Design a protein around this ligand. Sequence first.
Ligand SMILES: O=C(Nc1cccc(Nc2nccc(Nc3cccc(C(F)(F)F)c3)n2)c1)C1CC1
Length: 256
Amino acid sequence: QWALEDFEIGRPLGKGKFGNVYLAREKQSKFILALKVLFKAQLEKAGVEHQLRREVEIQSHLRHPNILRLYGYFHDATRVYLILEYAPLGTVYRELQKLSKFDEQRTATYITELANALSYCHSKRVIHRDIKPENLLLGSAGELKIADFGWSVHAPSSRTLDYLPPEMIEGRMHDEKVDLWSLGVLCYEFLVGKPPFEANTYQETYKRISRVEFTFPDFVTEGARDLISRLLKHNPSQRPMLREVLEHPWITANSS
Ligand SMILES: O=C(Nc1cccc(Nc2nccc(Nc3cccc(C(F)(F)F)c3)n2)c1)C1CC1
């Protein structure tokens, strides 16, 4: 039975959705971890307790080198506390704005690691549906880790905009092919420095996503163009399997 008294709190890592994440050390063992603090009142108001419950259930039970481990949880009067694996090298989000854009080797490596992780998730009937750079963390060896499971629905079939597929914004039926779409958007954003449907406006981004209207800058190689164009199909059925993505020649040539 964990309590706040069991941990020494350190620097704030991030300022989060429903509260900050802190660096923490467990007192007995000196184990370094991340403490995600969520405010109950704000969870009530947003009405996302189910998604939190699913998140907790999913992340505690899944075991993958490219998925951030969840060790446990506890609460008090005002807060819920998530006890998380600490990822030393931060978010791919910060990494992206620091480097501006990624080279093909770094990108294909990240895509490989994500595809492996999502392939595992999909085999356990878990669909992420909230994949984006700020939910992607880097471990001590720079290995990509899915940070959490977001505030999405995770069932095999269900019904910023930048990372959501056309079937999800149009209120249509959506499945595991959502994560393939997200993989296409990430691959584009990694190479270009911005997501393919980015706009100054929500209403415009919505239009871009629905029309699937994006263009490549000249420096995007044909192998990269081929994978991305395969992933960003309007019709989910047309999107490749994660298995095909892992075998794609551009991935093979460039991934570590
Ligand atoms: O800042 C550094 N590293 C760093 C920044 C931010 C986060 C981490 N690690 C980490 N490990 C486990 C979990 C998290 N979670 C987390 C990190 C950042 C933001 C949020 C959000 F937005 F959900 F609150 C959650 N972060 C590590 C240091 C320069 C390299």
